[PDB]
């Protein structure tokens, strides 16, 4: 229950592919790096952060 | 509660 709903994303740090799904590595606002997680695209609503991350990589 | 720049956790 305590992990349901949505939380503010601070940073998008990386992207990977697992089993046909694209996941992004997130820093969550208010949390330390220790709480960073990988989340699948379908979980995300942070298109400006995703754009900024991809642009940052070239 | 967030309305933008947000995500749901796999943990939930």
Residue numbers in the entry:
A (entry chain A): 24 to 81
B (entry chain T): 18 to 29
What did the study's authors say about this model?
HP1 proteins function as structural adapters which assemble a variety of macromolecular complexes via either N-terminal chromodomain or C-terminal chromo shadow domain. It has been reported that HP1 proteins mediate gene silencing by dynamic association of the chromodomain with methylated histone tails. Besides methylated histone H3K9, Cbx3, also known as HP1γ, can also bind to methylated Lys26 of histone H1 and methylated Lys185 of G9a. In this study, we determined the two crystal structures of the human Cbx3 (HP1γ) chromodomain in complex with methylated histone H1 peptide and histone methyltransferase G9a peptide to elucidate the structure basis for the recognition of Cbx3 to those two proteins.
However, Cbx3 chromodomain was found to possess strong binding affinity to both di- and tri-methylated H1K26, with a stronger binding affinity for the tri-methylated mark (Kd values of 21 µM for H1K26me3 compared to 52 µM H1K26me2). In the structure of Cbx3-H1K26me2 complex, the dimethyl-ammonium of K26 is accommodated in a hydrophobic pocket formed by three aromatic residues, Phe30, Trp51, and Phe54. The side chain of dimethylated Lys26 is stabilized by cation-π and van der Waals interactions within the aromatic cage. In the structure of Cbx3-H1K26me2 complex, the main chain of Lys22 at position −4 of the binding motif adopts a rotation of about 90° relative to the structures of both the G9a peptide and H3 peptide. As a result, the conformation of amino acid residues before the “KKAR(K26me2)S” of the methylated histone H1 peptide shifts from the positions of its counterparts in histone H3 peptide. The hydrogen bond formed by the side chain of Tyr18 of histone H1 peptide with Glu29 of Cbx3 stabilizes such conformation. Thus we proposed that specific binding of Cbx3 chromodomain to H1K26me2 should play an important role in H1K26me2 dependent gene regulation, and even development and differentiation.
